[PDB]
Amino acid sequence: DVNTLTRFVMEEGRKARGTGELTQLLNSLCTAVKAISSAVRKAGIAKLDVLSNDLVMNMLKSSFATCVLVSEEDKHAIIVEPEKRGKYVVCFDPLDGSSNIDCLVSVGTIFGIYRKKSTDEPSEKDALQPGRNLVAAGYALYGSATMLVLAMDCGVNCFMLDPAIGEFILVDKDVKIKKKGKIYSLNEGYAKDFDPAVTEYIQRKKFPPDNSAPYGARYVGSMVADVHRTLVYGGIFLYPANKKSPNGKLRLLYECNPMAYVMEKAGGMATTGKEAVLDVIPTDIHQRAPVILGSPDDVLEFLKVYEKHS
Amino acid sequence: DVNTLTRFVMEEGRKARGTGELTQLLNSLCTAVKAISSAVRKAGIAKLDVLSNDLVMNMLKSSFATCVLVSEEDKHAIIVEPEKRGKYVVCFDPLDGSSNIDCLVSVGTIFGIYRKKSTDEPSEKDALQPGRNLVAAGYALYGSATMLVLAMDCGVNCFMLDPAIGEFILVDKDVKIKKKGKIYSLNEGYAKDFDPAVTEYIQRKKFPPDNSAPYGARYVGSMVADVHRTLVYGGIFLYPANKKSPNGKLRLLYECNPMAYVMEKAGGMATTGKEAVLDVIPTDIHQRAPVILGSPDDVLEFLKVYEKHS
Amino acid sequence: DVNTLTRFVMEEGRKARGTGELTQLLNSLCTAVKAISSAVRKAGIAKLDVLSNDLVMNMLKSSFATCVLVSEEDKHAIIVEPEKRGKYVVCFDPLDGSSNIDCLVSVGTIFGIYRKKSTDEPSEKDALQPGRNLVAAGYALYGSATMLVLAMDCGVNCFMLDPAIGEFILVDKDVKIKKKGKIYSLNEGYAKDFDPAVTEYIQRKKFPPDNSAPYGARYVGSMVADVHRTLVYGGIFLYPANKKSPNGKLRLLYECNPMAYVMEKAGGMATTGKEAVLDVIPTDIHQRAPVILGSPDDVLEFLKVYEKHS
Amino acid sequence: DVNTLTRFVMEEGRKARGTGELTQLLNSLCTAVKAISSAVRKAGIAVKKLDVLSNDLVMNMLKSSFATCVLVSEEDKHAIIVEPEKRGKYVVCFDPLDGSSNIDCLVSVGTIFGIYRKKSTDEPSEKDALQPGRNLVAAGYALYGSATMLVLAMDCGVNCFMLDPAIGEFILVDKDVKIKKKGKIYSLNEGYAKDFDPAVTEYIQRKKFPPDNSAPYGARYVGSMVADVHRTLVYGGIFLYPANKKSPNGKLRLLYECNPMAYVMEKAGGMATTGKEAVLDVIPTDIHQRAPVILGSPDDVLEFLKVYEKHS
Numbered sequence A, B, C: 001d002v003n004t005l006t007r008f009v010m011e012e013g014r015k016a017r018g019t020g021e022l023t024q025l026l027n028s029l030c031t032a033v034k035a036i037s038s039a040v041r042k043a044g045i046a047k048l049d050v051l052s053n054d055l056v057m058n059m060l061k062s063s064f065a066t067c068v069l070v071s072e073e074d075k076h077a078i079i080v081e082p083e084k085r086g087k088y089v090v091c092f093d094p095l096d097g098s099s100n101i102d103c104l105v106s107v108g109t110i111f112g113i114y115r116k117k118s119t120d121e122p123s124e125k126d127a128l129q130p131g132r133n134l135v136a137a138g139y140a141l142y143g144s145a146t147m148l149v150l151a152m153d154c155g156v157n158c159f160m161l162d163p164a165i166g167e168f169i170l171v172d173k174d175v176k177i178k179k180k181g182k183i184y185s186l187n188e189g190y191a192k193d194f195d196p197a198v199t200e201y202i203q204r205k206k207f208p209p210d211n212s213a214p215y216g217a218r219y220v221g222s223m224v225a226d227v228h229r230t231l232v233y234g235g236i237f238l239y240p241a242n243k244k245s246p247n248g249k250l251r252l253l254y255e256c257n258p259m260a261y262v263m264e265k266a267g268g269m270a271t272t273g274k275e276a277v278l279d280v281i282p283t284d285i286h287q288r289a290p291v292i293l294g295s296p297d298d299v300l301e302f303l304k305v306y307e308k309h310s
Numbered sequence D: 001d002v003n004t005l006t007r008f009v010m011e012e013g014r015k016a017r018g019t020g021e022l023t024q025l026l027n028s029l030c031t032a033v034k035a036i037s038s039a040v041r042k043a044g045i046a047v048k049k050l051d052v053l054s055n056d057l058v059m060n061m062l063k064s065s066f067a068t069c070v071l072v073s074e075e076d077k078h079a080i081i082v083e084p085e086k087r088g089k090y091v092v093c094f095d096p097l098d099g100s101s102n103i104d105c106l107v108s109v110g111t112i113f114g115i116y117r118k119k120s121t122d123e124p125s126e127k128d129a130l131q132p133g134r135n136l137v138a139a140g141y142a143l144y145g146s147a148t149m150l151v152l153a154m155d156c157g158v159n160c161f162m163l164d165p166a167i168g169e170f171i172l173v174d175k176d177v178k179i180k181k182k183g184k185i186y187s188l189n190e191g192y193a194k195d196f197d198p199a200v201t202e203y204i205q206r207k208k209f210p211p212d213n214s215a216p217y218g219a220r221y222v223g224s225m226v227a228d229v230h231r232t233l234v235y236g237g238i239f240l241y242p243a244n245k246k247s248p249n250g251k252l253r254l255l256y257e258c259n260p261m262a263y264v265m266e267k268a269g270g271m272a273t274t275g276k277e278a279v280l281d282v283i284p285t286d287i288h289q290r291a292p293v294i295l296g297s298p299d300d301v302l303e304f305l306k307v308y309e310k311h312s
């Protein structure tokens, strides 16, 4: 039957007899996503990551379901005024890949939603929860089409934006990543700076000792695109720690965690090398994390080589 | 001032006091792109590159400006019935990258336009001209926005589709690629099969001898996106012959030739390793060709290593 | 603040802590509205009031909020299957004015929503309520822009569809009709059959006795266009009882009743001449009704003239 | 085969071996229509009022076409003389958003245009816009209704195009339209019946109460000229905005409302009169002068003109 994101969220929200605050929040995000999608298709005529930031910021503020908002674009967390204050914490990158938008390759919005756990007054620390605590997370990918991928406790669902009616149509129910993929994704230009484990794992994808087929390589350089491909076709994506960047480069709160959550809810894995990404407890909201995610056999096989190098 | 694609082609067409057949052909092409763009932003829905083929076929056949049409989706060249017959030959990929559209990564339309050179009755042979003979070429990239790249004798111009009004807006007049880039683009999964020249060139990009910065890596795997990025940012793109596809992989008539034409007309280069791409005289409509294209300094620096290897 | 139909409808439902079934009904209705609009902007291109009925029919059936559906296009009431059964009855014209769409004049969707009366099997009898029992009613007007007019207990609100984002933006909060207008609206070609009371009232509008300005005449003949203009500019709309048609022409259940409800909730009036439209108790789901509605001073002035005529 | 406005106009322009200045002008016009159509469908989500943008939209699209020298608009008191670098050979009279005082009620709005070729070799001036309607090269209207329709009348005839919003192309949906010989619908404001010229009261009375006791006509009046005329074209009948004694010259403007509708009507086999003459034969003395107009099906306008004769 015909399913929309807005119908989907109402059915499950009625099922659980919750107050509606999350359903309101998600509609607020999803309405913001359509706006960003619309501006991104004419992005150039007559900044853009600032429109996207203010759009999400204000649609979230006025949903009455948020108390603390963390954005890549703001130095400190945003504390909602008391009259509009609600029960959830939101971390989001409003336009990831906006530095690589001239080449018109994919850009995206990534979000993670937490519950405020304490009853203290809202502060920056309410966003410093571990990824395990995520209530809902996912991304909008503004590509050949606009797709919203929503991961929650029940699982991962893919909605396609139909611009003719401005509704997110359910196109992939409860998606589950392949156990093992045939594709690897990372920037090999920085091979000069690779941790030796990364060097060895990549060589094994290009030169298998067991004389099976070598893997293919893809790297758009936009995290939303690279991860979505890992989700849909299977494989491995790596933005790992090198010796210059000992904690990786991507941000934990609003890039690594929501992708780690989506992966895990699809049956995949997501690590820093040392632990699961979702078990890292943040002390800084803009802190970084290495990330290797994808099919469990591939993330495990990478972990097998990571173990070898001390 | 405000310029549209339809206006631009007519102004250059009026300037040359030509018959109007090419202007009609280009509008029939550009109208086709707008339909394809619509289809791609609304994909999924429970095959699509066949829509794109038949759209382009019928838009061209009824332009009265075409006589022989070569498409990736058809085994033989298409010979237009005489009542609609015209003076131009069109080679085209109606949806390049349509096998990687589940990942919502770029899809695109590539086209090459020849005036029929022989005076026989039209046949497949009329499509076997070399790229040097191209009158017009370019691509539509269905990405975060739909962008049309039109290369002609005067130079390269980029038009962005405005979806509110369905017009291609001029956003880049007389584009010129960077003299040298910082990005190389290829599938390194075929590393086991690389010609030593590609192997050495790639080694120089990751580990420079001159103690400069290594290049970055990008590879979408959809040729329109990689070429468009190379044009917009500079760098070098390679799909060389590996040991599996010894005559290269990309098609000469509608991938290599139109992209080589755009490169060269923007001050760049495009080679097979042995020669320039556009100087190759084709014998088969779906024949393949190795290709290395992009910035002149980068294409040249690769060619230096090709010489070194006999 | 920025308000959309979906955000507004969730807040009113949260405030009153209802089960959510009406909000789902309104959203399924709204999605049908957007779908109809898109088709109405491309009509003629190769009936349509059948697409709209099937569109509303299945959007409502699968809302899980309805049990009985009465349409202008189906002879009997439609009983929703028990798996999809809900507590509300909806009477609607899915595409009002579908006979005059060649002139690109307005078309519309009219709906009225009731609460199920029986606890038996839902049946046609559940649709035979008087207008007073209406939970919600209103119309979508597909004109120069698409407008949704939603009337509830709190009042009447007007929403404008933004097609770039496919969200209904609130543009008119708690609208109230002018006390007295300067425009009258009915078909004067049928003057031959007028009840003498109608003849006298209309003549008073062309030739005022008190030496005031004569009223203007407007008549689109599509009920959604005329009533909305009556709502927004004030005046009176008449499709009265003549002796040839003693029960009027428009259908009571899904044209007169929702329009009367919107009028009354907006500070206006709506009569059969003999009584209020919402006070008529229907005996047939397709029964007819005379209707005179609009600004209260004008309807009263008509009613005082109807009284004079025996 | 499947035809768009842009394909159609190029084919006819190549058939006639012309220079292209007219085709470019029409494309600049079509681009103006699509933009206005998009803005009208969002006529609420708020910087300047809409008819002021529409005027500037059409003004600058025509100026920068290199095909115009004189432009007459409802919103500008004098003709606008195009600067020489962008100067071309055509004159455009247009209403960029007709019916815009009644856009709040979402009833139809429209864009009306008539295009004349500059006749003199003098410097372009306001006088160049004073040609009569017969001299029209091209005219028609955009109706922004439930869908956006482009109606284009030329010497060969009248064609109706549908704006398809997914691709921004005007799709030809009605080739060489022809109005009914006789209709069953009349159109004018009967609120002003107290002020009717005596022939009008008689002709309307004949339509509500026919003497031959045939069927009475139905009445329709939107109050937007584009919609009222367009319904007349498609269904047949008669539209009237005639002269009363209070308004001896009618109300509508000749150069950019009456003339282009008269051209569309006549090229579609219809009629269009002031009562005293055919609309396209009036020789204008002021670019903003008014003219009465009665248009539509050939049989209906004639039955009116016969009543007009009885009255001196």
Ligand SMILES: CCc1cc(S(=O)(=O)NC(=O)Nc2ncc(Br)s2)ccc1-c1ccccc1
Binding pocket: A008, A009, A010, A011, A012, A013, A014, A015, A016, A017, A018, A019, A020, A021, A022, A023, A024, A152, A153, A154, C019, C020, C021, C023, C024
């Ligand atoms: C759909 C998301 C969701 C939202 C909420 S809630 O707190 O937002 N409540 C809520 O929306 N109630 C409503 N009542 C009437 C209407 Br109409 S919506 C509670 C649970 C879940 C959920 C998540 C995953 C699986 C299953 C359920």
Ligand SMILES: CCc1cc(S(=O)(=O)NC(=O)Nc2ncc(Br)s2)ccc1-c1ccccc1
Binding pocket: B008, B009, B010, B012, B013, B014, B015, B016, B017, B018, B019, B020, B021, B022, B023, B024, B152, B153, B154, D018, D019, D020, D021, D023, D024
């Ligand atoms: C723009 C494409 C083009 C088309 C043609 S043509 O053969 O199609 N003639 C043509 O269109 N004539 C017209 N007359 C009135 C109108 Br309006 S269009 C001839 C030359 C060029 C051209 C190409 C590159 C650089 C400069 C010009």
Ligand SMILES: CCc1cc(S(=O)(=O)NC(=O)Nc2ncc(Br)s2)ccc1-c1ccccc1
Binding pocket: A019, A020, A021, A023, A024, C008, C009, C010, C011, C012, C013, C014, C016, C017, C018, C019, C020, C021, C022, C023, C024, C152, C153, C154
């Ligand atoms: C907006 C229409 C409406 C719907 C409903 S309801 O039965 O649909 N319940 C409902 O929506 N609950 C939800 N809780 C959380 C979320 Br998120 S939705 C109850 C009352 C009213 C209402 C009507 C008129 C005035 C004021 C309110």
Ligand SMILES: CCc1cc(S(=O)(=O)NC(=O)Nc2ncc(Br)s2)ccc1-c1ccccc1
Binding pocket: B019, B020, B021, B023, B024, D009, D010, D011, D012, D013, D014, D015, D016, D017, D018, D019, D020, D021, D022, D023, D024, D026, D154, D155, D156
């Ligand atoms: C609006 C169509 C039209 C345009 C012109 S023109 O002066 O604009 N020439 C013109 O466009 N030439 C071109 N050359 C290359 C290309 Br591609 S178009 C002349 C006559 C007619 C015409 C009008 C009515 C019926 C039949 C034809």
